[PDB]
């Protein structure tokens, strides 16, 4: 009664089947009859018939995206027997037509990324319960494809349709006879040059309209882009939006706009998000009558409207920006200007809820920082990727014109006001650099090629920084007072500052670490640390997590050198230590015993350990997680229970373990998760996993072992049957390497 090939998972009172990416040649007939959702994506399935899903009474969702994985044949009426089927994902299946006889019960159908150039009544009109219909990306770029034929009135019978996406197809015109139930209409990149008055006239419920990419701005496009003749603007009739009273979202990115008709927004009192990226609106940004029409606008994106070849001294912001009373975020990337002056952002300064200013990628050379102070509620000052100095490749489910990840890492932003100056050229922080700023909590100085010696005075003007990112610089740690002016500092990321650390002959000082009363997380990764000056030990009463990966503990803990034997011992509060990627072949016993007894989580993965002393776990009574993945370990103790009472997770994947000793699991009651995958186990003896006492083992990973599928595997097979509480994932990847004829088969399948 152990499910195969799928993995069943409890989700919200129901069981779903995860069966994706398992090299399945066809729909498995062993799917649990009670499953409500079935993910069969990324397999090699080529055929779907009315026999594929028999008996699955309560199946509401099927994902068949990407079959076969590098044409899916679906018979007429194949899904008709599934009475509860609501959502059917058929993306990236090379479909030539919409499948015939789709179930009337469908509320969601996705046919994205196929070869469908004809939307017919035979295919669609009978699907009267459809709410969401995705037909995007069937004909686009330089793909060899036909222009899309939309049968007249095909969508007319879809009276519950709320979302229609037709983006990235050749449409030429907005389809007539759209149902008035529509809430979201996606028509991006459809080669529509003209929007008439009758196009959207009857869509009184529309909350989103996407017309982006029609008459695109094609200069420097990272895709094959074809402009309207002459690079003309999209042509939107004066009355084209007169009846869209409920509109909240309007995307007009890359429509080659030079002029925004203010009348378009006359009847849109709820417009909340306006996307105007990749146009030619520098003029409109400066004057902009339309800006007076949007008192409820929360997000305005005007990025990449730069004038080709133009590098003006200043940005020109209309006084009418002051009329955007509800504005929360303003995105002004790729405007391109040399200098940000205080008077230039005047109109923005009285906006009550404006919390985000995004000025990335403007080649700004200099800024008058005191201006941000004159704002009302600024939480995020994003100035990444400028020139500031001292003193299919496109995801069809993502935004096409910008990334959607947060501007600031949420862990950093959570502390408070953020200033992102990453990817600039602040190579030196002088006495006055950070004066007249707001109370910054989150400061990003990553990749500024800063080579200075932090001395303890640089951040004095912003003394309440909690999270400081100084990664990817070339910092010279030659002063024990470095960063000490930041008394409340909790997170310090110093990753990738290896420049000076790798030079044996210069001085290196890390003693400043001990000064902080509140420092919790310190990342020293990829710094090539192998030698320190005078003080060889890291010390801190507060530090909870140290990432020391990508350094040279192999040199630090070299047998002929005693000096670094206690390097981490003074981190009394430490619970997480990452020692991965340190080229470790062995850890001296005395060095290992000098690791903080307070550790709950220890990572030594991706080294070259040929040796591990399991006995030393006796000195780590709080240790819960031990990660030894990706080493060269051959040996497993048979006495683990004598060495730990606390270990919950033991990760041993990608090692050279070929034998599981008798009584390995005996009396280790704490162990919940054992990962032995990608090792050299040929079998598992009865006595290996046997126990008399209580065991809370709930996960055992074994995939990627060269199992011997003779009768010697019978005992473990029996053990699997008697322990269904113990999940073994990727059973299709738990594979017989022998005998010659049983090769490639799952061990779960054997007479």
Ligand X SMILES: *[C@@H]1O[C@H](CO)[C@@H](O[C@@H]2O[C@H](CO)[C@@H](O[C@@H]3O[C@H](CO[C@H]4O[C@H](CO)[C@@H](O)[C@H](O)[C@@H]4O)[C@@H](O)[C@H](O[C@H]4O[C@H](CO)[C@@H](O)[C@H](O)[C@@H]4O)[C@@H]3O)[C@H](O)[C@H]2NC(C)=O)[C@H](O)[C@H]1NC(C)=O
Ligand Y SMILES: CCOCc1nc2c(N)nc3ccccc3c2n1CC(C)(C)O
Ligand Z SMILES: *[C@@H]1O[C@H](CO)[C@@H](O[C@@H]2O[C@H](CO)[C@@H](O[C@@H]3O[C@H](CO)[C@@H](O)[C@H](O)[C@@H]3O)[C@H](O)[C@H]2NC(C)=O)[C@H](O)[C@H]1NC(C)=O
Ligand U SMILES: *[C@@H]1O[C@H](CO)[C@@H](O)[C@H](O)[C@H]1NC(C)=O
Per CB under 6 A, the list member of 37, 210, 458, 627 interacting with ligand X is 210
Rank residues 402 and 664 by Cβ distance to ligand X and give the closer one.
Answer: 402
Site residues for ligand X, 415-444, by CB under 6 A, read: none
- How many residues at the interface with ligand X, by CB under 6 A? 26
**Going residue by residue from 133 to 172, which x/- string records binding to ligand X, judged by CB under 6 A?**
----------------------------------x-----
**Residue 525's binding partner, choosing from ligand X, ligand U, ligand Z, none, with beta-carbon cut-off 5 to 8 A by kind?**
ligand X
| Residue 334 binds to a copy of itself (criterion: CB under 8 A) | yes
Instruction: Tell me how far, at minimum, the Cβ of 25 lies from ligand U, in Å.
Output: 15
If the CB atoms of residues 134 and 592 are measured against ligand X, the closer one turns out to be 134
| Cα 504 from Cα 495, distance rounded (Å) | 19
Considering the rule CB under 6 A, would residue 542 count as an interface residue with ligand U? yes
Q: How far apart are the first and last CA of the chain?
A: 16
- Which of 54, 75, 97, 118 binds ligand U (CB under 6 A)? It is 75
Residues 268 and 289: their CA atoms lie apart, in Å, by 15
Question: Residue 73 or 738: which CB sits closer to ligand U?
Answer: 73
Among 44, 117, 401, 428, binds ligand X (CB under 6 A): 401
Residues that bind ligand Z (CB under 6 A): 384, 405, 408-409, 412, 420, 422-423, 444, 446-447, 469
Helix (H) or strand (E) holding 467, with range, is strand 467-469
Interaction partner, residue 361 (ligand Z, ligand X, a copy of itself, none; CB < 5-8 Å by kind):
a copy of itself
Would you say 409 or 474 has its CB closer to ligand Z? 409
Minimum CB separation from ligand Y for residue 454, in Å? 11
Q: Is 545 in the site for ligand X (CB under 6 A)?
A: yes
Considering only CA atoms, which of 142, 147, 93, 144 is closest in space to residue 118?
Answer: 147
Q: Which residues pair with 73 in a beta bridge?
A: 47
Residues 560-599 that bind a copy of itself (CB under 8 A): 560-563
Q: Single out the residue of 176, 231, 269, 352 in contact with ligand U (rule: CB under 6 A).
A: 352
507 binds, among ligand U, ligand Y, ligand Z, none (CB under 5 to 8 A by kind): ligand Y
Check binding of 525 to ligand X (CB under 6 A).
yes
Out of 343, 395, 741, 751, the only residue in the binding site for ligand X (CB under 6 A) is: 395
Q: Does 500 bind ligand Y (CB under 6 A)?
A: yes
Return d(Cα 648, Cα 662) in angstroms, integer.
20
Instruction: For residue 186, give the nearest of 104, 275, 115, 99 by alpha carbon.
Output: 275
**Of 432, 437, 425, which is closest to residue 457 (Cα–Cα)?**
432
Beta carbon nearer to ligand X, 420 or 493: 493
- With residue 355 as reference, give the H or E element that holds it: none
Chain positions 326 to 365 lying near ligand Y, rule: CB under 6 A, are 334, 336, 361, 363
Q: Centre a 10 Å sphere on the Cβ of residue 263 and count the other Cβ atoms it contains.
A: 15
**Structural tokens at position 321:** 């920006």
Contacts (Cβ under 8 Å, ≥6 apart) of 211: 187, 188, 192, 195, 234, 236, 250, 251, 252, 255
Q: Which is nearer to ligand U, 118 or 479 (CB)?
A: 479
Q: Which of 26, 237, 344, 478 binds ligand Y (CB under 6 A)?
A: 478
Among 7, 385, 420, 493, binds ligand X (CB under 6 A): 493
From the list 55-63, 176-184, 216-224, 649-657, the region that binds a copy of itself by CB under 8 A is 216-224
Instruction: Please tell me the distance from the alpha carbon of residue 146 to that of residue 115, in angstroms, as a whole number.
Output: 9
One symbol per residue from 502 to 521: x for binding ligand X (CB under 6 A), - otherwise; what is it?
-------------------x
Nearest Cα neighbor of 188 from 134, 145, 152, 261 is 134
Q: What is the DSSP string of 61-103?
A: EEE-TT-S----EE-TTTTTT-TT--EEE-TTS--SSPPSS--
**Nearest of 306, 330, 326, 322 to residue 379 by alpha carbon:** 330
Q: Return the bridge partners of 357, or none.
A: 330, 381
CB of 303 to a copy of itself, least distance (A): 8
Residue selected from 73, 157, 235, 507 as contacting ligand U according to rule CB under 6 A: 73
Q: What is the DSSP letter of 319?
A: G
DSSP letter at 84?
A: T
Among 50, 196, 235, 346, binds ligand U (CB under 6 A): 346
* Shortest distance, position 334 Cβ to ligand Z, whole Å: 16
Q: Which does 75 bind (CB under 5 to 8 A by kind): ligand U, a copy of itself, ligand X, none?
A: ligand U
Q: Spell out a b/e string for 215-229, using b for 16 or more CB atoms within 10 Å of the CB, else e.
A: bbbbeeeeeeeeebe
| 479 lies in the site for ligand U, by CB under 6 A | yes
Q: Provide the token pair at 334.
A: 């790729």
Residue 358: strand pairing partners? 331, 382
Bridge-partner residues for 134, per DSSP?
110, 165
Secondary structure of 506-571 in HEC code, one letter for each residue: CCCCCHHHHHCCCCCEEECCCCCCCCCCCCCCCEECCCCEEECCCCCHHHHCCCCCCCCCCCCCEE
What is the rounded distance in angstroms from the CA atom of residue 536 to the CA atom of residue 421? Answer: 33
Do 485 and 459 meet the contact criterion of CB atoms below 8 Å apart?
Answer: yes
Least distance from C-beta 399 to ligand X, angstroms?
Answer: 4
Least distance between ligand X and beta carbon 744 (Å): 31
Report the distance separating Cα 37 and Cα 16, nearest Å: 5
- Of residues 216-275, those binding ligand U (CB under 6 A): 242-243, 267
List the x/- string, 344-373, binding to a copy of itself by CB under 8 A: -----------------x------------
Backbone angles phi, psi at 215, to 5 degrees: 60, 65
d(CA 568, CA 109): 56
Side-chain-side CA neighbours of residue 147 (13 Å): 7
- Is 474 among the residues that bind ligand U (CB under 6 A)? no
Q: Which range binds ligand X by CB under 6 A, 207-215, 457-465, 601-609, 675-683? A: 207-215
Which residue, 453 or 748, has its beta carbon nearer to a copy of itself? 453
Find the binder of ligand U among 2, 9, 29, 34 (CB under 6 A): 34
| Residue from 134, 155, 264, 304 binding a copy of itself (CB under 8 A) | 304
Q: Does 353 bind ligand U (CB under 6 A)?
A: yes
Total binding residues toward ligand Y, as defined by CB under 6 A: 17
In the complex with ligand X, which residue's Cβ is closer, 512 or 716? 512
394, 140 contact by CB (below 8 A): no
The one of ligand Y, ligand Z, ligand X, none whose footprint includes residue 405, by CB under 5 to 8 A per kind, is: ligand Z
Residue 311 partner contact from ligand U, ligand Y, a copy of itself, none using kind-dependent CB cut-offs of 5 to 8 Å: ligand Y
Residues 295-324 that bind ligand Y (CB under 6 A): 304, 306, 308-311
Tell me how far apart the 2 most distant CA atoms of the chain are, in Å: 84
Buried residues in 585-600 as b, exposed as e (16+ CB within 10 A): ebbeeebbbbbbebbb
- Residue keyed to tokens 């473990």: 716
Would you say 388 and 381 are in contact if contact means Cβ atoms under 8 Å apart?
A: no
**Two tokens, residue 342:** 């205080």
Binding residues for ligand X, rule: CB under 6 A, are 167, 184, 188, 208, 210, 212, 249, 251, 273, 275, 395, 397-401, 411, 471, 491, 493, 495, 521, 523, 525, 545, 547
Binding residues for ligand U, rule: CB under 6 A, are 33-34, 47, 49, 57-58, 73, 75, 201-202, 204, 242-243, 267, 325-326, 342, 346, 349-350, 352-353, 374, 455-456, 479-481, 520, 541-542, 544, 573, 589, 613, 615-616
Binding residues for ligand Y, rule: CB under 6 A, are 304, 306, 308-311, 334, 336, 361, 363, 453, 476, 478, 500, 505-507
């Amino acid at each position: 009664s152990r499910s195969y090939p799928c993995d069943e998972k409890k989700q919200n009172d129901s069981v779903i089947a995860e069966c994706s990416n398992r090299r399945l040649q066809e729909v498995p007939q062993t799917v649990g009859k009670y499953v409500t959702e079935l993910d069969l994506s990324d397999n090699f399935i080529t055929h779907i018939t009315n026999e594929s899903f028999q008996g699955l009474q309560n199946l509401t969702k099927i994902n068949l995206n990407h079959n076969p994985n590098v044409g899916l044949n679906i018979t007429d009426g194949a899904f008709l027997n599934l009475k509860n089927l609501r959502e059917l994902l058929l993306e990236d299946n090379q479909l030539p037509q919409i499948p015939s006889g789709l179930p009337e019960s469908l509320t969601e159908l996705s046919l994205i990324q196929n070869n469908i150039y004809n939307i017919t009544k035979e295919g669609i009109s009978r699907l009267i319960n459809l709410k969401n219909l995705y037909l995007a990306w069937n004909c686009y770029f330089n793909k060899v494809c036909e222009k899309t034929n939309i049968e007249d009135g095909v969508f007319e019978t879809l009276t519950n349709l709320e979302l229609l996406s037709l983006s990235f197809n050749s449409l030429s015109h907005v389809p007539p006879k759209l149902p008035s139930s529509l809430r979201k209409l996606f028509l991006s990149n459809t080669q529509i040059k003209y929007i008439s008055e009758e196009d959207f006239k009857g869509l009184i419920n529309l909350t989103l309209l996407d017309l982006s990419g029609n008459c695109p701005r094609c200069f420097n496009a990272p895709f094959p882009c074809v402009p309207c003749d002459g690079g003309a603007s999209i042509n939107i009739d004066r009355f084209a939006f007169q009846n869209l009273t409920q509109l909240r979202y309007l995307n007009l990115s890359s429509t080659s706009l030079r002029k925004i008709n203010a009348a378009w927004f006359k009847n849109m009192p709820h417009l909340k998000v306006l996307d105007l990226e990749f146009n030619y609106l520098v003029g409109e940004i400066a004057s902009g009558a339309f800006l007076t029409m949007l008192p409820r606008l929360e997000i305005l994106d005007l990025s990449f409207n730069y004038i080709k070849g133009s590098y003006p001294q200043h940005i020109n912001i209309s006084r009418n920006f002051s009329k955007l009373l509800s504005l929360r975020a303003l995105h002004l990337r790729g405007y391109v200007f040399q200098e940000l002056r205080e008077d230039d952002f005047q109109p923005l300064m009285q906006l009550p809820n404006l919390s985000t200013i995004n000025l990335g990628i403007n080649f700004i050379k200099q800024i008058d920082f005191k201006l941000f102070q004159n704002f009302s509620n600024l939480e995020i000052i994003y100035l990444s990727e400028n020139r500031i100095s001292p003193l299919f490749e496109f995801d069809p489910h993502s935004n096409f014109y910008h990334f959607t990840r947060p501007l600031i890492k949420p862990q950093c932003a959570a502390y408070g006001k953020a200033l992102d100056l990453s990817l600039n050229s602040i190579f030196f922080i002088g006495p006055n650099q950070f004066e007249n700023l707001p109370d910054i909590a989150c400061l990003n100085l990553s990749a500024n090629s800063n080579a200075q010696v932090l001395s303890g005075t640089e951040f004095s003007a912003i003394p309440h920084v909690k999270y400081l990112d100084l990664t990817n610089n070339r910092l010279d740690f030659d002063n024990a007072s470095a960063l000490t002016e930041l008394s409340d500092l909790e997170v310090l990321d110093l990753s990738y500052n290896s420049h000076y650390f790798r030079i044996a002959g210069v001085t290196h000082h890390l003693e400043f670490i001990q000064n902080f009363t509140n420092l919790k997380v310190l990342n020293l990764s990829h710094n090539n640390i192998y030698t320190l000056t005078d003080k060889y030990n890291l010390e801190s009463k507060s530090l909870v997590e140290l990432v020391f990966s990508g350094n040279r503990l192999d040199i630090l803990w070299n047998d002929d050198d005693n000096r670094y034997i206690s390097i981490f011992k003074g981190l009394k509060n430490l619970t997480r230590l990452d020692l991965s990627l340190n080229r470790l072949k062995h850890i001296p016993n005395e060095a290992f015993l000098n690791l903080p007894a307070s550790l709950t989580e220890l990572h030594i993965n991706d080294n070259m350990l040929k040796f591990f002393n399991w006995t030393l776990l006796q000195q780590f009574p709080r240790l819960e997680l031990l990660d030894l993945r990706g080493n060269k370990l051959l040996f497993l103790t048979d006495s683990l229970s004598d060495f730990t009472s606390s270990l919950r997770t033991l990760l041993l994947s990608h090692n050279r373990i070929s034998h599981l000793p008798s009584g390995f699991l005996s009396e280790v009651s704490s162990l919940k998760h054992l990962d032995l995958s990608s090792n050299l186990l040929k079998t598992i003896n009865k006595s290996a996993l046997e126990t008399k006492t209580t065991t809370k083992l709930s996960m055992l990973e074994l995939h990627g072992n060269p199992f011997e599928c003779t009768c010697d595997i019978g005992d473990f097979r029996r053990w699997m049957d008697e322990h269904l509480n113990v999940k073994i994932p990727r059973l299709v990847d738990v594979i017989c390497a022998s005998p010659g004829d049983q090769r490639g088969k799952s061990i779960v399948s054997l007479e």
